[PDB]
Amino acid sequence: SLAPCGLVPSARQLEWYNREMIAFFHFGINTFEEYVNEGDGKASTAIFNPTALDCRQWMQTLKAAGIPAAILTAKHADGFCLWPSKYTDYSVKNAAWKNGKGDVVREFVDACEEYGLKAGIYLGPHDRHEHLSPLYTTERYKEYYAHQLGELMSDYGKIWETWWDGAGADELTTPVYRHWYKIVREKQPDCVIFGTKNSYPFADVRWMGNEAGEAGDPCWATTDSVAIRDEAQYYKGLNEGMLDGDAYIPAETDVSIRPSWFYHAEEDSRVKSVRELWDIYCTSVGRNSVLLLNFPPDRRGLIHSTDSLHAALLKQGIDETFSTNLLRGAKVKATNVRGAKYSPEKMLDNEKNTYFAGKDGEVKADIIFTLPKTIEFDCLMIEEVIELGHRTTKWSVEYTVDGKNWITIPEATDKQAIGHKWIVRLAPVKAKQVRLRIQDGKACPAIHTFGVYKQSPVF
Secondary structure, three states: OOOOOOOOOOHHHHHHHHHOEEEEEOOOHHHHOOOOOOOOOOOOHHHOOOOOOOHHHHHHHHHHOOOOEEEEEEEOOOOOEOOOOOOOOOEHHHOOHHHHOOOHHHHHHHHHHHHOOEEEEEEOOOOHHHHOOOOOOHHHHHHHHHHHHHHHHHOOOOOOEEEOOOOOOOOOOHHHHHHHHHHHHHHOOOOEEEOOHHHOOOOOEEOOOOOOOOOOOOOOOEEOHHHHHOHHHOHHHHHOOOOOOOEEOOEEEEEEOOOOOOOOHHHHHHOOOHHHHHHHHHOOOOEOOEEEEEOOOOOOOOOOHHHHHHHHHHHHHHHHHHOOOOOOOOEEEEOOOOOHHHOHHHHHOOOOOOOEEOOOOOOOEEEEEEEEEEEEEEEEEEEEOHHHOOOEEEEEEEEEOOOOOOEEOHHHOOEOOOOOOEEEEEEEEEEEEEEEEEEEEOOOOEEEEEEEEOOOOOO
């Protein structure tokens, strides 16, 4: 067995990585206001009134889109609660919707269960509504939040992510988040925590410093926990992470399918294109991260058609692209092969658990794939055995036809991270042979997958 190298992921972190994509559902009282993305806590609860709400419809969107998990805004900073909490009146309890007798969180988690999707919860740390009270104190709010957390972590089935937005959360101290973390961890042991700012010691996953859907190149799963803490002053630390980072807290990349996070009819014509989403996919999922994509339900309580369409087409595109590893069938020769159990042919076998590996202490390897017939490709992907750590730290891919010389691939030269998955897109090339150069690392290579592909016409 290979020894792991450096910091390694937890069981939670492995489960989260494997999701690849997660849906965000930004919905609430803001949706019923005119052009509001950040509500003031002053809107009348009465205005919340979806007319054809169907969380099943939301789940059908996700099914078609290949998305295995979903996070609902149970409470945004406006402080309006989507479930009839015992601990406030600023909720659905006092909505026009269902004469105050509804529970959107209920509908949501019921639909997730029905469809076999993992449910998550966004419960806004900064609460503008509570801040309106002359009685507001941090200590008081800590208890309020804890009460609500208890409801959501107890009575609504299995919860697989809790999201703590850092926006406006600067007054919230580490010991406050501790109190909250203990609740999550006790009641929901498989629950992954997206943590920002002063929650840094409790975070399972981090922010990556923009909402544009662009994780860094490289993007390490490790970083210093101070980067989370001092968010605004460590863009690089968040976006790229650090190879020598003191913590294993991988990046989660969040973005809206629209210009805004909440629904506006005027943005129906401004949904990101399939090509845009493919780009994003490649700069998140394809840069050692996970893609959290927001679909905002409308005032009917439905996901818009365009949003749904584009997500569905991205899935088709992804599926077509990676369905055929053009290297399959190759004759493979490598340097630095640990053993038959670990032959380079493993990178090609489509098995979940097998991998190529090198010998202890030898961090370099060269692998040559000789193809029976010349292939045309414009995309490649490589996957590391992440349980074993970030091992490889420099890699390149080359090709030839006349075998007279190895031709470099501009976009796949002296790359750094691999981790969970790294995708490279490239001007189409024809190849009779392909070379994978493992050029440097902290330990001998351990690689699950290597492939080249032809991008779907969908894209």
